[PDB]
């Protein structure tokens, strides 16, 4: 009773056991969602319903335990925040989706309420510590790219304006609007059928179309290369910075041992 429970129950939630236990629950719930299937017995559907109910309450006590220990800090970790949303959506998607669709009927909901399934897959990222590590690593790369992504987006916009006006009048399915031209230039950037599918047909009508797309390919390839090179040397800087300090620290360790002893050589003259 009292905070003695809180001290003991933190020793549960923060335990390596509890983390691993929840991981297997997610895996098992992910597996049951693989045998869900329209062509099946009513008896299989009824059994899966109860099993899916068992999971939804079982993850509920997980969220309650995690909130009970982390409290005001729980609603600030993006990982814990995601898990909470998924449990809420998974409650609605099994005990209220029908009551919604039967009144707020929309054809999207029969396709959007599936999100309760996709969310329970993504929990396998949030629960596994090695997966949180790799995902946060990938996300932290994005801020360094924003300036070159903005540049690429601006170059695309300029070329989409030009391609619409140059080629859109006679090839509207490819360049007839700014949106058409944006999509087609993205295809060209990926080099997908860029010549046989796009630029060779154009040159039957616009012989100098190659003067547009070949410089385009050089630019966006050059910017993509420099984008990747930036990521490489950014990650390398994170390494080198560590090696640098260790060498400086040892120089300052060496500074300690030598200088703080060579000081004594002037007072040890009394010997």
């Amino acid at each position, epitope marked *: 009773r009292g905070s003695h429970m809180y001290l003991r129950i933190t020793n549960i939630v923060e335990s390596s056991f509890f983390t691993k236990f929840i991981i297997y629950l997610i895996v098992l719930n992910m597996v049951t969602m693989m045998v869900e299937k329209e062509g099946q017995s009513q008896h299989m559907t009824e059994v899966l319903y109860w099993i899916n109910v068992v999971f939804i309450i079982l993850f509920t006590i997980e969220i309650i335990l995690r909130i009970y220990v982390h409290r005001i800090s729980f609603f600030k970790d993006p990982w814990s925040l995601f898990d909470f949303v998924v449990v809420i959506i998974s409650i609605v998607g099994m005990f209220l989706a029908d009551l919604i669709e039967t009144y707020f009927v929309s054809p999207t909901l029969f396709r959007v309420i599936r999100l309760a399934r996709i969310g329970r897959i993504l929990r396998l990222v949030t629960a596994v510590p090695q997966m949180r590590k790799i995902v946060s690593a990938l996300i932290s790369v994005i801020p360094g790219m924003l300036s070159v992504i903005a540049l690429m987006t601006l170059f695309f916009y300029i070329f989409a304006i030009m391609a619409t006006q140059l080629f859109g*009048e*006679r*090839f*509207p*399915e*490819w360049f*007839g609007t700014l949106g058409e031209s944006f999509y087609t230039l993205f295809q060209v950037m990926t080099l997908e059928s860029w010549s046989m599918g796009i630029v060779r*047909p154009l040159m*039957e*009508v616009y012989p100098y179309a190659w003067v547009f797309f070949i410089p385009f390919i050089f630019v966006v390839t050059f910017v993509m290369i420099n984008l990747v090179v930036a990521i490489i040397v950014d990650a390398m800087a994170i390494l080198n910075q560590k090696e640098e300090q260790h060498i400086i620290d040892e120089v300052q360790s060496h500074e300690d041992n030598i200088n703080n002893e060579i000081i004594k050589l002037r007072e040890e003259i009394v010997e």
Partner: antibody, heavy 122, light 109 residues
Framework: EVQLVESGGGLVKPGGSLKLSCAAS????????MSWVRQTPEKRLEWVAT????????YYPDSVKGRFTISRDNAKNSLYLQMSSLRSEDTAMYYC???????????????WGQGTSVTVSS | EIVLTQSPALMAASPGEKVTITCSVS???????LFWYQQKSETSPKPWIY???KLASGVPVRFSGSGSGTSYSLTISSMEAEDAATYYC?????????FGGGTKLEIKR
């Protein structure tokens, strides 16, 4: 061989409606824009509709805007012209024609069907 | 919306004669965008010259085309009896095809 055959036509009353159909063979129909061209009884040729190869863009002269509707089915390899509010002006041989270049909605009409006569008369 | 006008409307011509017919354009157009068709009695038009001067596949090399800007022409160096037909010039601009009035060749006996 490339081949185009129009069908429908015949006699309509003014204000009436009629649907022409064109069947295409011997080429990748979905690679080409298609057009309909009138030939009036005094043998003047007059373009009346164009459709892009994917069907998403359609073009008409002001003489028929909103009265006619060009459409295509790339699976059936067929082309249609829904005509409505027909007038005596619209009495003509109607030809189905393929564009010279692929995807190009302009340029020239390199193959023409045999035509179907449409008479609009009371 | 560009109008194409052709002259003459009828041309009484004799085998072996050099025949030349004109298509005049109410605006300057690219010579790559002007086309010629040949239509024979109770058949559909067939493409004849692509751009101002490139003959279509199978056109007898006695045919030729020349022009630029607002004025274009089709020529037969020496007429043959099979050339008796109506010839239509055509252009494309904006998003509209327009056709010339046609020139009917009349073989002279």
């Amino acid at each position: 061989e490339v081949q185009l055959v129009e069908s429908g036509g015949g006699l309509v009353k003014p204000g009436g409606s009629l649907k022409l159909s064109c069947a295409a063979s011997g080429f990748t129909f979905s690679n080409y824009a298609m057009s309909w061209v009138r030939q009036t009884p005094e043998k003047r040729l007059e373009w009346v509709a164009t459709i892009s190869n994917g069907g998403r863009y359609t073009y008409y002269p002001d003489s028929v805007k909103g009265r006619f509707t060009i459409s295509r089915d790339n699976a059936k390899n067929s082309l249609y012209l829904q005509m409505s509010s027909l007038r005596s002006e619209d009495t003509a041989m109607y030809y189905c024609a393929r564009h010279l270049y692929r995807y190009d909605v302009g340029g020239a009409l390199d193959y023409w069907g045999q035509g179907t006569s449409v008479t609009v008369s009371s | 919306e560009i109008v194409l006008t052709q002259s003459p409307a009828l041309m009484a011509a004799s085998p072996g004669e050099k025949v030349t017919i004109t298509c005049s354009v109410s605006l300057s157009i690219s010579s790559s965008n002007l086309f010629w068709y040949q239509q024979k009695s109770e058949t559909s038009p067939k493409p004849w010259i692509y751009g101002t001067s490139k003959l279509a596949s199978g056109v007898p090399v006695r045919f030729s085309g020349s022009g630029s800007g607002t004025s274009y022409s089709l020529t037969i160096s020496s007429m043959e009896a099979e050339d008796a037909a109506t010839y239509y010039c055509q252009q494309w601009s904006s998003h509209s095809f327009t056709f010339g009035g046609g020139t009917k060749l009349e073989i002279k006996r």
